[PDB]
């Protein structure tokens, strides 16, 4: 059933001898050569350099909070950089942050000690994780940190960074405490005067170059992904592709996910219109998102496959016809020396004859074939 067109005709006709005529055997199809995913250019980008490349950092008890929205958040440069000692993602894998959107992303930056870096994670315990910054067990996001000894450490001690030692209750997730009030740890009351049982709850890190790795300053930024009912504001940059035209390619333009061959178009869109449509509610032209231009799409070429053969008793030679297919795209029959073209389609295995004789086998579109000396 798959050796030669005459054999493909015999299988469909369920007969060893095939009468003279034109018989449909299969369906021609042009498969997608490749896949392209084109999305609008990054243009305005999330300014993660405002937090990561910030000149000064806040204390852990006074951790800064920045809202990131209405921008594309590129993360390839983040986890590729080797300057970061800690890069841990909880509840999500590094690949999909460039594919998943969230309504809000929070950048929470502060400075802690080297041995306190492990304390920023769900289900963590310690002085920082209980009195300075608490993370929920269902936290969605990543915690990133990098060594900052060359900046936040000063000879003789840099005391600009402070941390809380005591608190009556554990800090709730995503909570801040700037109380800086005289904490009480005894039955004796107090009136804001330092004494035997009256203590200042704030102590400052001693950051010195000679300190150990566990005693070195470490700048920490926590990125908090979160999805609410309101539609997402930050979408990761979908991987851009090279535009390919005149070749049948699977395409994905902002979720169109259509199949066909794209060519440069002529119709004019209004600037607010993103993709065209035909009468039958089938996508017909698409505005290219990277650069503002119009691309007319047409379906991948397909058509019936017919076998034009005389009686099998008369001959075994056959000629195939691919209806509604241009002759160039056909090769995607072994007698490829002669390839005639007609309005009906691409006729392989026969030769056009300038002379005209009465028709017995109708090819289609006015042309007809026949066995001849």
């Amino acid at each position: 059933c798959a050796l030669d067109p005459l054999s493909e005709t015999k299988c469909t006709l369920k007969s060893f001898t095939v009468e003279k005529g034109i018989y449909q055997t299969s369906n021609f199809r042009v498969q997608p050569t490749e896949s392209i995913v084109r999305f609008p250019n990054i243009t305005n980008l999330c300014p993660f350099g405002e937090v990561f490349n910030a000149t000064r950092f806040a204390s852990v008890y006074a951790w800064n909070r920045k809202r990131i929205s209405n921008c594309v958040a590129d993360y390839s440069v983040l986890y590729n950089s080797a300057s970061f000692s800690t890069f841990k993602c909880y509840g999500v894998s590094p690949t999909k942050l460039n594919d998943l959107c969230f309504t809000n992303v929070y950048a929470d930056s502060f400075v802690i000690r080297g041995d306190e870096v492990r304390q920023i994670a769900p289900g963590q315990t310690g002085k920082i994780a209980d009195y300075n910054y608490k993370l929920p067990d269902d936290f969605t996001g990543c915690v990133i940190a990098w060594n900052s000894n060359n900046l936040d450490s000063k000879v003789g001690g840099n005391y600009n960074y402070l941390y809380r030692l005591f608190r009556k209750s554990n800090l709730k997730p995503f909570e801040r405490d700037i109380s800086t009030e005289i904490y009480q740890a005894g039955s004796t009351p107090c009136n804001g005067v330092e004494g035997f049982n009256c203590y200042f709850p704030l102590q400052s890190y001693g950051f010195q170059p000679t300190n150990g790795v566990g005693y070195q300053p470490y700048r920490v930024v926590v990125l908090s992904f979160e999805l609410l009912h309101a539609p997402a504001t930050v979408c990761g940059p979908k991987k851009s592709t090279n535009l390919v035209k005149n070749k049948c390619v699977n395409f994905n333009f902002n979720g169109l996910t259509g199949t066909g061959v794209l060519t440069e178009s002529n119709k004019k869109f209004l600037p607010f219109q993103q993709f065209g449509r035909d009468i039958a509610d089938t996508t017909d032209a698409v505005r290219d998102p990277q650069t503002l231009e119009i691309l007319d799409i047409t379906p991948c070429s397909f058509g019936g496959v017919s076998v034009i053969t005389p009686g099998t008793n008369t001959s075994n030679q056959v000629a195939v016809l691919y209806q509604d297919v241009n002759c160039t795209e056909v090769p995607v029959y072994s007698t490829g020396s002669n390839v005639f073209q007609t309005r009906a389609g691409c006729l392989i295995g026969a030769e056009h004859v300038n002379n005209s004789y009465e028709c017995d086998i109708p090819i289609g579109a006015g042309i007809c074939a026949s066995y001849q000396t």
């Epitope: 986890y79 841990k88 993602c89 909880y90 509840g91 590094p94 994670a121 067990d137 269902d138």
Partner: antibody, heavy 129, light 110 residues
Framework: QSLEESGGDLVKPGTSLTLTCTAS?????????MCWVRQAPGKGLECVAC???????TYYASWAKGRITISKTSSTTVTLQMTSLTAADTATYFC???????????????????????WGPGTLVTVSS | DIVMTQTPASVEAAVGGTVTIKCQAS??????LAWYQQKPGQPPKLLIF???TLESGVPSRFKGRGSGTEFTLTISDLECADAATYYC???????????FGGGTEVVVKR
């Protein structure tokens, strides 16, 4: 912060017993991985089976072929079930808490639940006629 | 598919001495190692994680080194309370599995 075990007692061979751990001070979020560590009287420890709340799937040890079942019944309960109890099941069973996190690597992205931090007192399970 | 071989079965030293614990990974475990101290009738307590980082609250004498298939734990200035059973657990991310070692017993010579 606290993990407590229950359900261990003397059970005849061939029947089934259930073991339960309760989450107090925290909830069974997707960021946590729960496993069972069993040690025999005067012997070493071994991992029975594990459940990942992130994916909802469960991994089992090689020595068990459908004999062990894990099901997180609620946000503060995860149950264990051992069938076809034999003398090899006479041991003390513990349950602890782990964390699952993702790191970008050359080959791809891998899930890490490396070490175990906080545990529970454990319940002794004895199998005899 | 992983076996943590722990040698020797026991280690001894006087007060203030040094005892080493040798743990071998049959297949490469990389950096997912932990050490645990366990007393009879009490749950294992984490000493070292990452095989090079001190758990919060543990004394500095509990030191761990090694990577790949050779994992080490040395105790300095042995105390009377250090007499317990120590284990090494390597997490193989390839099979998402935990395997424990045979165990090491600490004896305080006197």
């Amino acid at each position: 912060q606290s993990l407590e075990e229950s359900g261990g007692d003397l059970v005849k061979p061939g029947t089934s017993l259930t073991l339960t751990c309760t989450a107090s001070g925290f909830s069974f979020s997707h960021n946590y991985v729960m496993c069972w560590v069993r040690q025999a009287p005067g012997k070493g420890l071994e991992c029975v089976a594990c459940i990942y709340f992130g994916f909802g799937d469960t991994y089992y040890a090689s020595w068990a072929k459908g004999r062990i079942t894990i099901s997180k019944t609620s946000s503060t309960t995860v149950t264990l079930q051992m069938t076809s109890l034999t003398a090899a099941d006479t041991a003390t069973y513990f349950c602890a808490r782990a964390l699952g996190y993702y790191i970008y690597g050359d080959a791809g992205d891998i899930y890490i639940a490396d070490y175990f931090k906080l545990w529970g007192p454990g319940t002794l399970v004895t199998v005899s006629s | 598919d992983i076996v943590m071989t722990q040698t020797p079965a026991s280690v001894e030293a006087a007060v203030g001495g040094t005892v080493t614990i040798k743990c071998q990974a049959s297949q490469s475990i990389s950096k997912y190692l932990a050490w645990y101290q366990q007393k009879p009738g009490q749950p294992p307590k984490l000493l070292i994680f990452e095989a090079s980082t001190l758990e919060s609250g543990v004394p500095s004498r509990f030191k761990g080194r090694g990577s790949g298939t050779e994992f080490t734990l040395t105790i300095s200035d042995l105390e009377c309370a250090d007499a317990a059973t120590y284990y090494c657990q390597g997490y193989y991310y390839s099979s998402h599995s935990y395997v424990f070692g045979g165990g090491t017993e600490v004896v305080v010579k006197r």
